Amino acid sequence: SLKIKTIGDRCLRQKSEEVEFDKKEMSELYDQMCEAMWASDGIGLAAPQVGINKRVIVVDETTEEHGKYAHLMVNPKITWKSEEKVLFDEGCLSVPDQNGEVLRPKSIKVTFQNKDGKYKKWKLDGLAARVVQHEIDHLEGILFVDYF
Numbered sequence: 001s002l003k004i005k006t007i008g009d010r011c012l013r014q015k016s017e018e019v020e021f022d023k024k025e026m027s028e029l030y031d032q033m034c035e036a037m038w039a040s041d042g043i044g045l046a047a048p049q050v051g052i053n054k055r056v057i058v059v060d061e062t063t064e065e066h067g068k069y070a071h072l073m074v075n076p077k078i079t080w081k082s083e084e085k086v087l088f089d090e091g092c093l094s095v096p097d098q099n100g101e102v103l104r105p106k107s108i109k110v111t112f113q114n115k116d117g118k119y120k121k122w123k124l125d126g127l128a129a130r131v132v133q134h135e136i137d138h139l140e141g142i143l144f145v146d147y148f
């Protein structure tokens with residue numbers, strides 16, 4: 001099963017490597033990441049948090065209308081960030097019992113491969129832009145406490 005690594009583990013500081021997409025393998029990884037994320041009431045997770053230093057994140061988007069759902073983002077890359085910043089109180093399953101206000105760009109554009117291997121580009125803002133930037137930071141060996 002996937003176990004979530006916590007601050008002090010050096011694998012949280014190693015940069016993650018690009019994935020060559022495989023639909024079946026990503027499906028398995030997706031299922032296990034979602035399970036780990038949701039079991040601890042998270043809304044994002046990066047592969048290095050579960051000991052896999054590959055460039056894969058998941059972002060919750062559970063709704064009343066459609067039920068539990070999360071986006072898979074393989075090799076996510078920010079191609080644009082707004083000049084405008086917003087402050088948000090962050091936490092992290094890999095940094096338990098710590099929170100704090102972090103300034104980041106309010107909106108971004110991100111490219112990635114989805115669950116099905118299609119190349120996507122989305123313009124994100126609000127909470128989606130926040131979770132994506134936090135999760136991509138994990139792939140660069142960055143924890144949110146580094147901003148303080």
Ligand SMILES: [Zn+2]
Nearest residue numbers: 091092093094
């Ligand atoms: Zn995190």
